[PDB]
Amino acid sequence: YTMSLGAENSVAYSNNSIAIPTNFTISVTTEILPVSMTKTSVDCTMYICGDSTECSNLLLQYGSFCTQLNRALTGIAVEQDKNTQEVFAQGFIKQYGDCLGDIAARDLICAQKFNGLTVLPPLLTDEMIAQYTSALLAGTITSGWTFGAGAALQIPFAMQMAYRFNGIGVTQNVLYENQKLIANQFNSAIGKIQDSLSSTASALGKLQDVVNQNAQALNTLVKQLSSNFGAISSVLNDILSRLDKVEAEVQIDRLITGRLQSLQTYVTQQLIRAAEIRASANLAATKMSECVLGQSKRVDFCGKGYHLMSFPQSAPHGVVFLHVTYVPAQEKNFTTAPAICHDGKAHFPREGVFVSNGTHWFVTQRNFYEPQIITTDNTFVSGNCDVVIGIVNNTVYDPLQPELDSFKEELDKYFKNHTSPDVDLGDISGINASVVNIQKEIDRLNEVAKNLNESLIDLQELGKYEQYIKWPWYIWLGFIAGLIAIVMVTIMLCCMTSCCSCLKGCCS
Amino acid sequence: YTMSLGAENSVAYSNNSIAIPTNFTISVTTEILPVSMTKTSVDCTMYICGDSTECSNLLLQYGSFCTQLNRALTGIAVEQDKNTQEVFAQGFIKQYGDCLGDIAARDLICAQKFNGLTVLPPLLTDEMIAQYTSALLAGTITSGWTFGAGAALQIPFAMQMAYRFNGIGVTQNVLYENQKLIANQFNSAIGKIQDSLSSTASALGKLQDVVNQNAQALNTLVKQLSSNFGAISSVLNDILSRLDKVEAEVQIDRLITGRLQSLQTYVTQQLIRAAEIRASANLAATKMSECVLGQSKRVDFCGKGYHLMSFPQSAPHGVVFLHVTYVPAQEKNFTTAPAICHDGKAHFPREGVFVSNGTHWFVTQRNFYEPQIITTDNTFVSGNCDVVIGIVNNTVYDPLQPELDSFKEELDKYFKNHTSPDVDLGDISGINASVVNIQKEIDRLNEVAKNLNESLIDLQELGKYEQYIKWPWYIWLGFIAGLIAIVMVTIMLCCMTSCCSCLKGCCS
Amino acid sequence: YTMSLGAENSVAYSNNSIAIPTNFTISVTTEILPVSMTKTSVDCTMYICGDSTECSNLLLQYGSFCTQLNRALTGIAVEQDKNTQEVFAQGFIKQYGDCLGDIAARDLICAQKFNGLTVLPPLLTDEMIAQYTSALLAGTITSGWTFGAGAALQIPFAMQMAYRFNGIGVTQNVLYENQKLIANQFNSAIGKIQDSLSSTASALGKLQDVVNQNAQALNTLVKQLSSNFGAISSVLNDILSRLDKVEAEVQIDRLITGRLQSLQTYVTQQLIRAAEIRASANLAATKMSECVLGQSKRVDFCGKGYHLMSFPQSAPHGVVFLHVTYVPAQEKNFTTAPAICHDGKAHFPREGVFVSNGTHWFVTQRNFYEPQIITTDNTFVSGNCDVVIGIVNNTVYDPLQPELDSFKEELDKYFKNHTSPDVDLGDISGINASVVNIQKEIDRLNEVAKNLNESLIDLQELGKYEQYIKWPWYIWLGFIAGLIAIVMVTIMLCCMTSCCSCLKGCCS
Numbered sequence A, B, C: 001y002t003m004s005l006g007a008e009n010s011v012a013y014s015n016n017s018i019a020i021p022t023n024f025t026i027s028v029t030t031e032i033l034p035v036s037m038t039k040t041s042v043d044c045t046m047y048i049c050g051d052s053t054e055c056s057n058l059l060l061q062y063g064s065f066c067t068q069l070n071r072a073l074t075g076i077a078v079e080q081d082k083n084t085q086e087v088f089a090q091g092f093i094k095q096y097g098d099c100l101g102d103i104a105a106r107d108l109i110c111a112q113k114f115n116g117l118t119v120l121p122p123l124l125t126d127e128m129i130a131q132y133t134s135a136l137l138a139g140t141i142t143s144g145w146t147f148g149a150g151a152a153l154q155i156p157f158a159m160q161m162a163y164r165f166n167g168i169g170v171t172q173n174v175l176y177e178n179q180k181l182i183a184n185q186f187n188s189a190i191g192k193i194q195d196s197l198s199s200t201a202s203a204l205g206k207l208q209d210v211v212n213q214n215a216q217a218l219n220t221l222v223k224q225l226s227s228n229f230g231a232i233s234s235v236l237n238d239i240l241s242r243l244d245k246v247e248a249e250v251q252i253d254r255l256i257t258g259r260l261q262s263l264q265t266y267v268t269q270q271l272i273r274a275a276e277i278r279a280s281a282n283l284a285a286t287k288m289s290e291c292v293l294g295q296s297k298r299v300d301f302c303g304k305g306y307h308l309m310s311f312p313q314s315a316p317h318g319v320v321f322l323h324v325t326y327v328p329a330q331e332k333n334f335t336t337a338p339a340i341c342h343d344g345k346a347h348f349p350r351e352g353v354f355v356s357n358g359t360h361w362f363v364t365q366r367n368f369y370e371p372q373i374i375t376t377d378n379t380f381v382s383g384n385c386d387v388v389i390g391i392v393n394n395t396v397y398d399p400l401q402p403e404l405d406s407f408k409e410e411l412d413k414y415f416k417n418h419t420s421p422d423v424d425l426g427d428i429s430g431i432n433a434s435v436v437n438i439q440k441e442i443d444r445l446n447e448v449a450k451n452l453n454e455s456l457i458d459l460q461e462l463g464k465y466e467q468y469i470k471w472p473w474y475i476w477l478g479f480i481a482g483l484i485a486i487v488m489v490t491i492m493l494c495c496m497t498s499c500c501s502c503l504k505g506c507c508s
């Protein structure tokens, strides 16, 4: 801001050419200004979604922004209604053989001895019976002649009878003591097989109890477990089905947000145009009176050229002016000067310009070439040549534009990144559930149930007897009759001398 | 844009009535302009959420938009602080009977034969003993008289004794061979029952091994599986809970977004009003000087009325002017003309209007009725009658309004639809887990354990008896005394002639 | 709006000092106006996300909002291309003893009786054999002398033989009947043990079938269940993995939305500045002609000072005026009045101010001190003193500021709160899966498998022996030779008188 620049040199003494109107021609202008606008309501639902029903249902939850934006576009406080609705969701036998061999005679001399008794085997053969029965008879023959015991021959018969009865006795005694052994040991064995089958019955019973209980346990587990999976199934379905819903909504809400902005852009443009319409209405107030009620002394304002008269008329959202004016039909370039500094005495005009007919300056009217003479009534004089310099920099407003960081730097201010563990369950396939094989033992049991059959005793039929071999009381006197035959020969030997008469016949 | 319209006919030549001020009255106006604007700040959290704590937290994640919007409302780049905080999350017997029967004494003639020996049954009856013992005795009687073998009668006694001993021999031999058979077959049977019970023990043992191993396997599976169902129970619960968080947040963020816009509307309105306040401050600069430092030549500027003087008074956020003016006390309608075309020579005024006192035109001052005479110093003259036509259509800016498609057409540009399969698990209820039934066999086994009792052998007591039957050595000479009695009768028969004397008595 | 205020007292009259220019000085001003604004294209992706790739992808779904905002900033309907791309996702024995005691003599008199037969025990002792064999022999001695039955002595031998054979018969018969009993009861017992082992085999077979069937059932369940837990593992992994994704996106979209606004703020500021540039271009149209094509009669307009001439030049995005003017170098305070009411006749000036040299008023030019005399050609006169009052309150537009409720009250209009049940599965640990204990019975069965080993009968060896004691046919005549020895003594007793000669020797 200097009070001066140079000496006798400035734009203020530029002295250059400039067009001045010389002749004129009648003119008119039609000038149009808008003063009002068609503020119309906008349906956000029609603007953002249009006809996309999977959006129409969601945009509703965003709120009454639609009203806020319409309150802006249209200067009408919409008198909305009131609604109270809220959703709510709730033995000796061999030894006798070995010693006697095949000599039937050695029979009695081979008699063995068990304990305090003499024994023989119980079998007489045609050789032995010949020996003893002819010995018995010979002892009965000799005794009739011999003075004493011709019956010394009968000892072997009477003894071999006694010894054999003893042999039978010792052999029956053991047959019986064997019978007591086989009876006791079979009684003891069936006592132990009775225990065995009580124990097998108890073992089979216990197995049956558990195998059945555990079958029940598997059934119960299967009933519950197959229900549990049915429950897991239903629950995972609800989740997947809702996750899918969320994956539709979380996409659709992003496009809606973009359109919400795109709508806020349309709204902002309308307000910006509304401020220009209302500035054009403020301009129409000056423009209408400075010509209609008055006459403007300006240029190009309210009608191109120099304003004279005006006739206004209306339009649907505006005013139209049929202004009247005059314009240069003919105009000429003249060397002119804002000021002229004479010997340190700056000189300028009053209500006009300096213009130069070649020989000297005149003052003239800026907008009509009519030279006038220079005088104090027509000019100003200043004792200082120096030219004052001003500066006027019309800075239209510089907004404090937003100052966003990188997105990462704002994100990490509050964003919690996340990664849940890769969860897994415990493998049950380590369960072996071993099977059983007893088919060897079951086939073996069948084998012995078949083979026990062979052991079924099949003795050699002996026979009991003791049937009807009885004599009758009516005939029992049969032997008494024999005694009567002894009486009959008692007459024949009434004396023995008849035998002596037969011995006399043996002599003769 | 025509250089002409018609001949002697235009809005420029048509003369009509206009209101010219005739008398005046002193006036003032108070004119107010707001030059300043207290741009107050705004708390987004209070604006969007207010007091809804389930929202206050969400706004933090949105970012510092609140600052960006306040930098717009205000004009000072708020000097915010710096914070470095980041969350982080990590036998013969029958045949002897059949042939004998009960006839006399066929006993010996009925003797049978096994192998090379003759046999009889071992039973003598009072009938048979009478036959044989009286036969034996009769053979001892006859032999005393008969010259030879009267003992032919003794053959049947001596033979039947021998045959019976044989019968007893053949019947003992088999009684022994039956005894060996019974012993062997019982020894073989207990050999097979020993195998059977070794097998049964092996079968029961291995069954016990598996049933008990499989019980362990069920326990182990139940321990793991019941833990496993506990794990999914905990994991589903997280999924469910975290989704409750999502389904709340994904709803609440939609209403927040609507308010974010509703806030961007408030902010936009403020900037729009800020631009009008700053345009009103630009208008106050012209209005203040054109009337304070100077005097305006306009009719309605600085308040309706011809401005004369001004006195400004500062206001907190505006400026108040007490302007001084004059207004038409009396005004009159006059037929006036912008121009008048005389014989092809268009004619208009200088710094005024044409006005018509009935007989002829005058020039006058537009805003005061003072008629003046027409002259070149007071008017302009043209050569051409033709009227030039201009058009000035003040189009306030038409913005490039947004050009959104249907929502569907923008959605399908990037939207993915995702329907996951209706997942299901495999039904385990095809597991039958059969049960076991051994009752019949366990019952049968306890019934044979009861019934084996009947087989306990109960033999018929026989008796041994081989003890007190021993003669003493002190008395054994008892039979030697008998031999001494034989010596005593040896004197009585010292000769036999004493028996002859008794036979002589039998004669007499 | 009053037509009057007071009498002889108003701001229109109250006079006071004012600064009128007295001397002047040549001046210039440089005045700058912008008339154009660079409409640059802004990349939303660079503005919102910058370089954060986990955001760049999301902006795609946000749709063509970037174009809508650029259409606003840059008034150019960008001719975008067309793309058709859509993603798609598809016995008697004792009794004989008790009675006979120790008397070989009581032998026969102690014979017992079973049924219809007499019995003795089958054992002869050296005492009994002495009795009977010496009785037998004595009966053969006596019978040679006695007239009749000296053989009465032989009854006891012949009877005791018969009775003992019976004793042996009754004792063989019962031994045979014991043998049948044991055979039958062993045959019946092995018949019942055969049943038992058929039943044990059936029981073991049925326990093998099920235990092995249930092992298969456990295997099948384990195969399916371990697959089923694998399927769950995979499905819960999807849910979680995709939920994590949603928890990233639902956070990141909130910061994006905040920047979307922060961007809509930048865009709004640009439009606001664009409206001021275009208002500055509208101001440049008046400013350029009122000073270039003409000369303004206003104050401070076209730079400080009274405008005289102008020289315009271009600017980067505006216009620069080198205006020429004059300014007060020297100015003086003067007591001046807009109007002066003389005796009810209000009086004001024409095209100037009243100024007061001490003695009286003058009219003068507002912007130059040159006193002039008061006259009707230089002033206006009114009839009424009364001062008219106007008011002009320039209300810059008051917008319909948004009218948001509390957030809760808008939220509850459509927000559905949701709390799913705390789902749980049914506890399977109530499954007992009882084990089995059979050891006692298996050890008992192995102990009997060893116990019966003793019951193996070990009879007392008896012996058969029906071997070779046979006589040869070549020697059988041995006893016939005995008959020849009987013939040899038949000569010695050819008569008995030789025995009589020996009895005569017994006499002598």
Ligand SMILES: *[C@@H]1O[C@H](CO)[C@@H](O[C@@H]2O[C@H](CO)[C@@H](O[C@H]3O[C@H](CO)[C@@H](O)[C@H](O[C@H]4O[C@H](CO)[C@@H](O)[C@H](O)[C@@H]4O)[C@@H]3O)[C@H](O)[C@H]2NC(C)=O)[C@H](O)[C@H]1NC(C)=O
Pocket: A357, A358, A359, A360
């Ligand atoms: C710039 O404007 C100037 C103002 O008009 C012009 O200069 C003028 O020129 C005229 C022409 O002579 C002059 O007129 C008078 O000059 C003498 C008195 O000053 C006087 O002797 C003249 O009278 C005689 O001449 C005329 C014919 O010209 C005869 O009719 C008379 O009978 C007599 O013989 C006459 O009165 C002006 O004085 C003079 N003015 C000034 C101030 O200069 C310039 O011509 C013009 N520039 C250009 C380039 O044209």
Ligand SMILES: *[C@@H]1O[C@H](CO)[C@@H](O[C@@H]2O[C@H](CO)[C@@H](O[C@H]3O[C@H](CO)[C@@H](O)[C@H](O[C@H]4O[C@H](CO)[C@@H](O)[C@H](O)[C@@H]4O)[C@@H]3O)[C@H](O)[C@H]2NC(C)=O)[C@H](O)[C@H]1NC(C)=O
Pocket: A391, A393, A395, A398, C032
């Ligand atoms: C009327 O007022 C206008 C409103 O302020 C002024 O506009 C300003 O003009 C200046 C200078 O041109 C400009 O400064 C920047 O210009 C470059 C583009 O923005 C930029 O590269 C510059 O940076 C360089 O220069 C500086 C200074 O030497 C260094 O510190 C830097 O390191 C770098 O080398 C510089 O920052 C303003 O941006 C601009 N403001 C606006 C809002 O337009 C007019 O200049 C003024 N006219 C006059 C003289 O009346």
Ligand SMILES: *[C@@H]1O[C@H](CO)[C@@H](O[C@@H]2O[C@H](CO)[C@@H](O[C@H]3O[C@H](CO)[C@@H](O)[C@H](O[C@H]4O[C@H](CO)[C@@H](O)[C@H](O)[C@@H]4O)[C@@H]3O)[C@H](O)[C@H]2NC(C)=O)[C@H](O)[C@H]1NC(C)=O
Pocket: B357, B358, B359, B360
């Ligand atoms: C539009 O304005 C016109 C301008 O004022 C008016 O016309 C004027 O009318 C007057 C009245 O006569 C006239 O005055 C003179 O007329 C004669 C010379 O032109 C002359 O003879 C007159 O003098 C005689 O008459 C007067 C009385 O009127 C006597 O006092 C004298 O002693 C003498 O006897 C007088 O000087 C104007 O000349 C005339 N002007 C013009 C240019 O027309 C119109 O009346 C007015 N329109 C309306 C509708 O009123």
Ligand SMILES: *[C@@H]1O[C@H](CO)[C@@H](O[C@@H]2O[C@H](CO)[C@@H](O[C@H]3O[C@H](CO)[C@@H](O)[C@H](O[C@H]4O[C@H](CO)[C@@H](O)[C@H](O)[C@@H]4O)[C@@H]3O)[C@H](O)[C@H]2NC(C)=O)[C@H](O)[C@H]1NC(C)=O
Pocket: A032, B391, B393, B395, B398
């Ligand atoms: C001053 O400038 C204004 C700014 O441009 C002009 O406003 C324009 O005026 C025209 C005509 O009224 C208008 O055109 C449309 O008008 C109807 C409503 O928008 C619309 O239905 C029209 O469509 C019909 O007519 C055309 C042409 O025959 C056919 O092609 C169509 O098929 C259909 O039948 C037409 O598009 C502009 O919208 C409007 N623009 C703006 C931004 O206001 C003034 O007309 C102008 N005044 C003058 C003459 O100085």
Ligand SMILES: *[C@@H]1O[C@H](CO)[C@@H](O[C@@H]2O[C@H](CO)[C@@H](O[C@H]3O[C@H](CO)[C@@H](O)[C@H](O[C@H]4O[C@H](CO)[C@@H](O)[C@H](O)[C@@H]4O)[C@@H]3O)[C@H](O)[C@H]2NC(C)=O)[C@H](O)[C@H]1NC(C)=O
Pocket: C357, C358, C359, C360
């Ligand atoms: C406000 O402006 C007023 C206008 O200029 C000033 O008043 C003026 O004062 C002068 C000075 O006297 C006066 O001049 C004449 O006064 C008489 C006729 O009215 C006449 O007698 C005077 O002539 C005599 O005096 C002079 C010297 O002054 C001699 O040269 C003469 O030879 C003779 O002897 C003279 O013509 C004005 O009339 C008068 N005007 C009015 C309307 O008042 C004021 O002075 C000024 N205010 C201030 C504070 O200065």
Ligand SMILES: *[C@@H]1O[C@H](CO)[C@@H](O[C@@H]2O[C@H](CO)[C@@H](O[C@H]3O[C@H](CO)[C@@H](O)[C@H](O[C@H]4O[C@H](CO)[C@@H](O)[C@H](O)[C@@H]4O)[C@@H]3O)[C@H](O)[C@H]2NC(C)=O)[C@H](O)[C@H]1NC(C)=O
Pocket: B032, C393, C395, C398
């Ligand atoms: C030029 O037009 C301007 C635009 O309308 C007017 O501004 C208005 O001025 C009034 C009064 O100052 C103001 O009213 C409110 O002022 C307070 C702050 O907003 C507020 O507390 C007031 O409330 C109190 O007073 C009322 C009335 O007695 C009671 O009902 C209330 O209960 C309470 O006690 C009052 O509401 C407007 O807000 C304001 N409007 C705007 C948009 O600026 C200028 O007053 C006007 N100037 C003139 C006189 O030409």
Ligand SMILES: *[C@@H]1O[C@H](CO)[C@@H](O[C@@H]2O[C@H](CO)[C@@H](O[C@H]3O[C@H](CO)[C@@H](O)[C@H](O)[C@@H]3O)[C@H](O)[C@H]2NC(C)=O)[C@H](O)[C@H]1NC(C)=O
Pocket: B417, B419
């Ligand atoms: C994206 O997937 C959506 C399912 O998740 C699918 O919605 C389904 O659309 C079909 C076709 O419109 C509907 O089928 C029936 O819909 C109504 C029923 O009254 C009828 O008007 C139709 O004619 C048709 O019979 C399904 O009911 C519907 N499913 C659900 C759960 O809403 C969308 O269509 C898919 N979008 C695209 C672009 O493919």
Ligand SMILES: *[C@@H]1O[C@H](CO)[C@@H](O[C@@H]2O[C@H](CO)[C@@H](O[C@H]3O[C@H](CO)[C@@H](O)[C@H](O)[C@@H]3O)[C@H](O)[C@H]2NC(C)=O)[C@H](O)[C@H]1NC(C)=O
Pocket: B244, C417, C418, C419
């Ligand atoms: C929507 O459901 C929300 C649960 O999903 C529920 O939040 C719950 O609100 C109750 C009541 O405020 C809380 O109970 C306690 O909250 C604090 C605990 O310190 C106390 O101040 C309270 O007095 C009360 O004892 C629950 O803790 C809370 N649950 C959770 C998980 O945050 C909302 O209230 C529900 N909203 C509506 C409108 O019903």
Ligand SMILES: *[C@@H]1O[C@H](CO)[C@@H](O)[C@H](O)[C@H]1NC(C)=O
Pocket: A013, A014, A015, A335, A337, A339, A340, A341
């Ligand atoms: C005006 O221009 C003329 C040339 O046309 C020149 O001679 C004269 O000195 C200039 N005057 C001033 C004051 O610059």
Ligand SMILES: *[C@@H]1O[C@H](CO)[C@@H](O)[C@H](O)[C@H]1NC(C)=O
Pocket: A381, A382, A383, C022, C023, C024
């Ligand atoms: C201004 O000062 C100049 C130089 O002294 C002088 O010539 C001129 O007359 C003065 N103007 C006024 C109105 O006093």
Ligand SMILES: *[C@@H]1O[C@H](CO)[C@@H](O)[C@H](O)[C@H]1NC(C)=O
Pocket: A430, A431, A432, A433
């Ligand atoms: C499964 O069987 C293998 C061999 O077949 C054995 O090594 C392992 O110990 C068994 N595991 C279980 C739990 O039975």
Ligand SMILES: *[C@@H]1O[C@H](CO)[C@@H](O)[C@H](O)[C@H]1NC(C)=O
Pocket: B013, B014, B015, B335, B337, B339, B340, B341
């Ligand atoms: C002006 O109006 C009058 C009628 O009052 C008419 O006679 C005259 O011709 C008009 N003049 C023009 C130039 O239109």
Ligand SMILES: *[C@@H]1O[C@H](CO)[C@@H](O)[C@H](O)[C@H]1NC(C)=O
Pocket: A022, A023, A024, B381, B382, B383
């Ligand atoms: C303009 O032209 C007209 C018609 O020829 C003429 O009468 C008039 O004098 C001219 N005006 C000027 C200032 O040359």
Ligand SMILES: *[C@@H]1O[C@H](CO)[C@@H](O)[C@H](O)[C@H]1NC(C)=O
Pocket: B430, B431, B432, B433
């Ligand atoms: C289940 O039992 C039915 C008959 O009861 C049979 O047809 C089917 O094969 C069995 N399935 C299994 C796996 O045991």
Ligand SMILES: *[C@@H]1O[C@H](CO)[C@@H](O)[C@H](O)[C@H]1NC(C)=O
Pocket: C013, C014, C015, C335, C337, C339, C340, C341
């Ligand atoms: C002007 O001020 C003077 C005092 O300087 C006073 O005498 C006079 O009455 C005032 N005039 C008016 C109209 O107020």
Ligand SMILES: *[C@@H]1O[C@H](CO)[C@@H](O)[C@H](O)[C@H]1NC(C)=O
Pocket: B022, B023, B024, C381, C382, C383
């Ligand atoms: C206006 O009225 C006043 C007061 O009656 C009077 O003196 C004056 O001459 C009138 N002015 C006009 C132009 O008629």
